[PDB]
Write a protein that binds this ligand. Structure first.
Ligand code: PC1
Ligand code: 3PE
Ligand code: 3PE
Ligand code: 3PE
Ligand code: 3PE
Ligand code: 3PE
Ligand code: 3PE
Ligand code: 3PE
Ligand code: 3PE
Ligand code: CA
Lengths: 287, 139, 827
């Protein structure tokens, strides 16, 4: 307090409303501007209706009001974020006119953060959340190391198996029954041989989920491991590997992965969270 | 005495020696080409294990029970490999079955392996289960 | 007066829960007149208590404040419906608001009112955090509308309802990704919406990873701060010549043998094939069962010769074997041997009793949770009654039109068609009656298959017509308000109930250091003499050598990750094996195997070394002329936690507590074993047809496949699809027995009682095992790292042996010189 830090009192003249109800107008404008982003309707590959062309105009009004607010607040922690928002906004607004940009319109969705930065009773809650995110550090490191180990294991064992499925003979149409998904196949091995009547198992196939779930390289393997850790569609990978390379050896990598994602992750996380909440109860009560 | 003459470790070693003799049988009882190198390697592992597993009793050199088990373990872990290279050879070189040789090998693998793991866990000092205990402590 | 009002309240609840689709006319004629007479009697009682309690006694009593509301609302609805009231959805919502009157039974119930007060206190405490969560959801919905808005311009005909076209749909998709249901299907659409599995396209897979890792972290911070900070406050404030065998029957011989005599008698049902009951193995299993029942009837008669709770259990399990000799029910009720082990090991006794008292503690919270479900079920029946029908082709909107055959186009190719007969199919999970509605809400509460009901309720047309594409987009509010309460709130406070009780059933610094003071001991360091080898010993234990090994391990990991698909992985591995064998030999030469096989981590190091060497040898043989033997190279990084001071300790803590309750983990194993055999017997002959949920990988044919199916249903996969894949009408596989004509008789509706129950019990059990551990380590979970902790004393222990080579009791008083190294928290 009791500082100018820019220039003498001749400059800080407009700082008379900062103690007026100014915490209810720029907040009202931020809530009117977060509603001008919900009614925007995105259309496929460069189409537009009238309402979007009107919102493109209204964006200028909103940017200018926020810039003049920052201009009446500059001469007088979260204001850092507010200035970053205004900077990105004016950058976008001038770039979209230099051409006469999607990556420059994607940052327009940070505006609602000014709403949390407005009310002070919410920043204490956000700070509590951030402070409680700390004691989970060892658990986070353990989960990262386990995901890495399992990704490397899967990358070693199942590197390039799920690349065969029976097409039709003399055809590039994968052969499946009505409700089946395109699971892998294997001919003259352990893997499942298929029985679609006009079908043959031949290689050159991207992958089960259009090539997204497989163990080819480290990236997709880590992705599949992370997806199995969340217990969503882990039986799908288990089956895609339990019917394309064997049936009695690939059940261990998955079941174990679950028991190391179900037991340990939930137990450790809930334990440390309940412990921190107990310490919070004690530091709030013993006073 | 405590890790060398307790009943559990004693009966486990009594089981693993039977595992070794059945491994010898399954090696000789014959009932693709690398199936012999893995086997002689497992045999050398059994020898290298029993060398330090016999001398672990005397001189109170008990700590050598820790490496010995591993060798036994690896012995089993080697034999299993040969096991597969037999099975695959059947799918490589009609009706087949698994006579004396394969059944004795499938028994010896489990016996040697589980006995070696149990011997390792019986020789390893302790899980603390108390805030003041620790591994590698005096008696 | 309590019974006087409970009679009419129960009668009104019955008139509510009596409604269903296609009810006879007389049922409606009964329900409407019952509503009328009960509204008039509610008026009579309201006016009686008004004339008997004074005018200024019905507008401040919250407990009976909204009975005037009830009667006035009933009158308003009567007079609005008696006139011309179009929009049958209007009648539906007017009867939805009618369902409020059943809350007098909750209000007069004092304990229920106390629970309402507790819950309202909790929610008024967490309103701000809930608002922050809602704002985060909105921000991510907007970011999704930016990224994938209108980018589902797919040229094919598969429907993708969980897209980001407008704001309500973006909110629905973000909520679905948040609750973790089918979120991996909303990610593949977002990936293929960009290029594909290419470099710039897969990078959109990090919008769904931040939304599920940090969107479920906040969600746990909210609904677990309501149960340690406002639910715990409720309890806190509440606080302020027959002796020839009598000799061994108590000896360890008889007991320890009759214990192991069951674990192999239970395995008589495991090794069984249920497709054909008579083969070359079932005879052997019956022959073994002869002994497995004789050696136990001998036991029970050896018990009866001495004497005259659990003994009757053993008696029944041994009496069913005599009648082993309808016919399919006795065979099912014969796996009872695993139960009668609680009175033998005396380890299951305590866990069974503790869980049977934990069930006792929980009762007033589960009552209201099952009422809320029953409540919502009635609202659903009012909303979606009979609107869940749909023809086979979406172009026919009535059961009169949905006949004949129609064309199905493969791959959306208008030149590759097939004929299929259309049929008016009733959806699997529907809302016709309160039973079916309660079933559907039960499946929704477990989050499995809730979007497929959401996009069916959204499309609901009238009361007996086909689904219209996005007809009602405001129908998702009912599926979002129920998933935010019962499936989110109630469950999180029900777990808080248990957690808080564990703490109660489960100053303090002085109660651990005393044990650490007298029960501890000096430490070993193995400082060697004979400087000849002390030379290499000083660098072997030096810090920069361990830093070098850290770096080499990380380099090995990076070289192990570099591999891809379609000769630099064969030689660098040999180099790394050589360097690590060098490390092994060196540390073996500076410890003479005396201090090498003392530390368990070097015990593990030697294992890794020998395994990697054998792997290199086998690879050499491979190249000259065992896939799992390569796993020993990835194990090399597990020793990275030799320096993990705060992670190895956490693993120690949470591992030494899974060895203190091996019996709570025996309950789950017994549950799986008891349910797998019942499954194998009941539904074991269903044909394995691909495209259905009972296929070559998910079936009850063998025992391991049954256990894997049970594990899948436990961990929370599509269990409600299996539940419909094994219910009375599937094809029996040919290797079974059936007369020509009796082929479509596999499965049975008993499945509904089989799976539901299994999802309750298992869940319950998975709670206990998860909290029995959490309560076991409330020391470590709540440890102030500044006042005093066994970390300080372990540091002191390690500093003690720094000057003291062996134990040798205490040391000379000069090493006071080490007291200058301890910290003020200790000195
Ligand atoms: C800090 C990290 C903490 C977490 C890490 C701790 C756990 C480490 C992860 C566990 C290892 C994963 C299991 C191995 C996967 C084997 C499956 C498989 O091989 O299938 C395909 C492979 C396919 O190989 P294949 O030879 O069948 O291929 C085809 C063969 N022909 C040509 C005949 C068709 O199956 C096999 O490798 C056969 C071997 C069967 C068993 C081998 C696996 C043994 C693994 C030992 C378990 C380790 C104990 C876990 C440690 C404790 C952790 C709780
Ligand atoms: C329990 C809660 C259950 C559901 C909560 C409801 C939250 C609102 C969801 C959005 C909504 O219902 O209205 C969106 C509507 C825009 O959609 P509309 O123009 O009607 O288009 C129809 C289809 N094209 O109108 C809007 O776009 C208004 C959106 C503005 C809301 C965000 C304002 C910020 C405040 C955040 C805290 C709330
Ligand atoms: C088998 C060979 C050895 C297996 C690993 C066993 C090593 C071990 O458990 O060490 C004990 C460790 C902490 O215990 P302590 O040594 O008392 O404390 C450290 C100093 N404060 O406690 C722990 O290590 C926690 C458990 C570690 C789990 C890693 C698995 C290692 C085996 C694979
Ligand atoms: C604030 C709250 C929490 C915040 C968490 C933030 C997590 C962010 C996730 C980061 C994801 C990785 C980011 C870098 C991706 C780089 C992708 C790349 O470089 O190449 C693409 C990759 C492999 O190459 P690709 O392009 O597919 O080649 C094909 C032909 N050219 O192909 C790929 O598909 C690679 C994609 C792999 C992504 C896997 C990420 C999963 C990691 C799971 C760990 C989460 C555990 C949470 C622990 C916290 C504890 C509470
Ligand atoms: C808050 C805002 C932070 C996120 C910024 C997202 C915007 C930057 C991505 C740039 C982009 O949208 O795409 C550019 C480029 C091509 O994509 P596009 O132009 O849409 O289509 C190809 C046209 N032939 O890129 C492509 O070719 C494919 C798309 C690029 C990768 C998509 C970016 C997804 C990353 C999401 C991470 C942020 C989510 C969570 C953020 C939390 C808040 C910080
Ligand atoms: C108690 C009775 C309240 C009945 C509320 C109701 O009628 O539910 C409708 C609501 C979805 O709205 P809907 O009626 O489908 O929209 C009309 C479009 N023609 O879906 C609902 O909101 C029903 C659930 C709301 C009331 C149930 C208990 C609420 C308790 C806190 C919320
Ligand atoms: C508190 C901690 C919180 C954690 C925060 C981080 C969370 C996000 C983590 C997500 C990381 C995912 C990164 C994705 C990288 C994928 C690399 C890739 O795209 O492909 C693999 C590439 C070869 O593949 P390809 O592109 O096919 O090669 C030729 C073209 N086909 O070749 C490679 O790229 C191989 C390189 C990767 C191998 C690395 C091996 C493990 C290294 C980890 C060591 C320690 C981890 C860091 C320590 C963190 C602790 C502070
Ligand atoms: C620390 C406390 C921990 C608490 C634990 C909590 C409970 C967790 C328990 C979950 C364990 C899930 C068990 C999953 C393994 C089941 C085996 C499996 O799924 O593999 C299938 C495969 C069958 O294939 P196949 O024989 O070919 O069948 C068709 C004919 N070709 O199988 C095979 O063909 C290969 C042979 C497999 C058989 C060996 C494996 C054992 C099988 C029984 C597992 C245990 C059953 C008892 C119940 C355990 C659950 C507690
Ligand atoms: C209360 C919330 C959930 C309770 C609802 C249970 C399911 C239900 O009520 O639906 C009944 C179901 C109706 O199905 P529907 O499609 O109409 O059938 C047509 C062909 N029969 O038809 C049925 O199959 C009814 C069978 C209900 C199953 C009840 C048996 C449960 C056993 C209780 C043990 C576990 C509970 C104790 C553990 C508590 C731990 C949380
Ligand atoms: Ca799921």
């Amino acid at each position: 307090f009791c500082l100018t830090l820019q220039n003498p009192l001749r400059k800080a003249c407009i700082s008379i409303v900062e103690w007026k109800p100014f915490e209810t107008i720029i907040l009202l404008t931020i809530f009117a501007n977060c509603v001008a982003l919900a009614v925007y309707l995105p259309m496929p590959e460069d189409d537009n209706n009238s309402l979007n062309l009107g919102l493109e105009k209204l964006e200028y009004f909103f940017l200018t009001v926020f810039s003049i607010e920052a201009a009446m607040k500059i001469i007088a922690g979260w204001n850092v974020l507010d200035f970053i928002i205004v900077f990105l906004g004016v950058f976008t607004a001038i770039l979209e006119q230099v051409n006469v940009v999607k990556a420059l319109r994607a940052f327009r969705v940070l505006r609602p953060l000014r709403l949390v930065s407005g009310v002070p009773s919410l920043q204490v809650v956000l700070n509590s959340i951030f402070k409680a995110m700390l004691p989970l550090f060892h658990i986070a490191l353990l989960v990262l190391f386990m995901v890495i180990i399992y990704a490397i294991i899967g990358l070693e064992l199942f590197k390039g198996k799920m690349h065969k499925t029976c097409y039709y003979i003399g055809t590039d149409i994968v052969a499946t029954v009505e409700n089946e998904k395109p699971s892998p196949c294997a001919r003259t091995g352990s893997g499942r041989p298929c029985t679609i009547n006009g079908s043959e198992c031949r290689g050159g196939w991207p992958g089960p989920n259009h090539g997204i779930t497989h163990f080819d390289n480290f990236g997709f393997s880590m992705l599949t491991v992370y997806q199995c850790i969340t217990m969503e569609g882990w039986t799908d990978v288990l089956y895609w590997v339990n019917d394309a390379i064997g049936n009695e050896w690939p059940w261990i990598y998955f079941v174990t992965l679950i028991l190391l994602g179900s037991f340990f992750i939930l137990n450790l996380v809930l334990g440390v969270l309940s412990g921190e909440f107990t310490k919070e109860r004690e530091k709030a009560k013993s006073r | 005495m405590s890790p060398t003459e307790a009943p559990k470790v004693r009966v486990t070693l009594f089981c693993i020696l039977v595992g070794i003799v059945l491994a010898m049988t399954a090696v000789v009882s014959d009932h693709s080409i690398s199936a012999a190198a893995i086997s002689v390697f497992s045999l050398g592992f059994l020898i290298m294990g029993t060398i330090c597993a016999l001398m672990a009793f005397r001189k109170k050199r008990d700590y050598l029970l820790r490496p010995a088990s591993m060798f036994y373990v690896f012995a089993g872990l080697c034999l299993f490999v040969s096991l597969e290279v037999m099975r695959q050879s059947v799918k490589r070189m009609i009706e087949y079955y698994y006579s004396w040789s394969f059944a004795c090998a499938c028994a010896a693998f489990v016996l040697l392996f589980l006995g070696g793991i149990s011997l390792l866990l019986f020789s390893l000092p302790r899980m603390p289960q108390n805030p003041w205990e620790s591994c590698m402590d005096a008696e | 007066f309590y019974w006087l009002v409970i009679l009419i309240v129960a009668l009104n609840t019955l008139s509510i829960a009596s409604e269903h689709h296609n009810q006879p006319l007389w049922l409606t004629h009964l329900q409407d007149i019952a509503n009328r007479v009960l509204l008039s009697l509610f008026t009579i009682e309201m006016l009686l208590k008004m004339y008997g309690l004074g005018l200024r006694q019905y507008f401040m009593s919250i407990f009976n404040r909204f009975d005037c509301f009830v009667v006035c609302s009933g009158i308003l609805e009567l007079l609005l419906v008696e006139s011309g009231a179009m929009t049958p959805l209007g009648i539906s919502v007017l009867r939805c608001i009618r369902l409020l009157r059943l809350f007098k039974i909750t209000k007069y119930w004092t304990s229920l009112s106390n629970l309402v007060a507790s819950l309202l206190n909790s929610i008024r405490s967490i309103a701000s955090l809930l608002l922050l969560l809602f704002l985060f959801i909105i921000i991510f919905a907007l970011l999704g509308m930016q990224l994938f808005g209108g980018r589902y311009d797919f040229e094919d005909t598969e429907v993708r309802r969980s897209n980001f076209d407008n704001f309500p749909q973006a909110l629905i998709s973000v909520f679905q990704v948040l609750t973790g249901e089918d979120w991996n299907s909303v990610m593949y659409n977002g990936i293929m919406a960009y290029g594909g599995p290419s470099y710039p396209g897969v990078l959109v897979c990090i919008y769904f990873i931040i939304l599920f890792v940090c969107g479920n972290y906040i969600l746990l911070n909210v609904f677990l701060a309501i149960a340690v900070d406002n639910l715990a406050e409720a309890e806190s404030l509440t606080s302020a010549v027959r002796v020839l065998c009598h000799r061994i029957v108590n000896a360890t011989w008889f007991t320890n043998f009759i214990l192991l005599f069951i674990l192999l008698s239970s395995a008589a049902l495991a090794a069984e094939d249920p497709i054909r009951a008579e083969s070359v193995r079932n005879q052997i299993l019956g022959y073994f069962d002869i002994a497995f029942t004789s050696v136990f009837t001998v036991e029970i008669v050896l018990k009866m010769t001495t004497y005259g709770y659990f003994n009757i259990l053993d008696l029944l399990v041994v009496a069913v074997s005599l009648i082993s000799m309808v016919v399919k029910i006795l065979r099912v009720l014969r796996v009872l041997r695993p139960l009668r082990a609680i009175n033998r090991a005396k380890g299951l006794k305590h866990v069974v009793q503790c869980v049977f008292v934990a069930i006792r503690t929980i009762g007033n919270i589960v009552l209201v949770t099952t009422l809320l479900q029953f409540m919502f079920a009635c609202i659903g029946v009012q909303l979606f009654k009979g609107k869940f029908f749909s023809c086979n082709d979406l172009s026919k909107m009535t059961e009169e039109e949905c006949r004949g055959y129609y064309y199905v186009y493969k791959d959306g190719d208008p030149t590759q068609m097939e004929l299929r007969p259309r049929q008016w199919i009733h959806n699997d999970f529907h809302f016709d009656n309160v039973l079916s509605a309660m079933m559907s809400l039960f499946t929704v509460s477990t989050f499995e298959g809730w979007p497929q009901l959401l996009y069916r309720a959204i499309d609901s047309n009238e009361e007996d017509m086909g689904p219209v594409y996005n007809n009602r987009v405001e129908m998702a509010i009912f599926f979002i308000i129920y998933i935010i309460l019962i499936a989110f709130f109630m469950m999180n406070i029900f777990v808080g109930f248990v957690i808080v009780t564990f703490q109660e059933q489960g100053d303090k610094n002085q109660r651990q250091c005393v044990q650490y003071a007298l029960k501890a001991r000096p430490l070993r360091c193995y400082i060697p003499k004979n400087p000849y080898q002390y030379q290499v010993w000083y660098v072997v234990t030096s810090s920069y050598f361990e830093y070098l090994m850290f770096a080499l391990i990380m380099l090995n990991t990076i070289c192990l990750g570099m591999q891809h698909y379609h000769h630099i992985s064969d030689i660098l591995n040999v180099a790394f094996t050589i360097i690590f064998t060098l490390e092994m030999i060196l540390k073996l030469l500076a410890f003479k195997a005396r201090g090498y096989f003392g530390d368990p981590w070097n015990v593990f190091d030697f294992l890794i070394v020998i395994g990697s060497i054998i792997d290199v040898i086998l690879s050499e043989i491979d190249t000259f002329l065992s896939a799992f033997f390569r796993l020993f190279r990835v194990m090399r990084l597990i020793k990275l936690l030799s320096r993990a001071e705060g992670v190895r300790t956490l693993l120690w803590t949470f591992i030494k507590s899974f060895q203190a309750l091996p019996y709570v983990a025996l309950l789950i194993v017994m549950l799986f074993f008891i349910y797998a055999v019942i499954g194998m017997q009941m539904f074991g002959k269903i044909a394995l047809v691909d495209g259905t949920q009972i296929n070559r990988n998910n079936n009850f044919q063998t025992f391991p496949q049954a256990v894997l199916l049970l594990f899948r249903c436990a961990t929370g996969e599509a269990w409600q699809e299996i539940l419909l894949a094994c219910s009375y009408g599937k094809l029996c596989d040919p290797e079974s027995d059936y007369a020509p004509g009796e082929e479509y008789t596999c499965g049975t509706n008993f499945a509904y009682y089989y799976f539901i129950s299994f999802y309750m019990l298992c869940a319950f059990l998975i709670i206990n095992l998860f909290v029995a551990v959490i309560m076991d380590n409330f020391d470590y979970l709540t440890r102030d790292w500044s006042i005093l902790g066994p970390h300080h004393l372990d540091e002191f222990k390690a500093i003690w042996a720094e000057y003291d080579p062996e134990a040798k009791g205490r040391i000379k008083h000069l090493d006071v010189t080490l007291l200058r190294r301890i910290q003020p928290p200790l000195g």
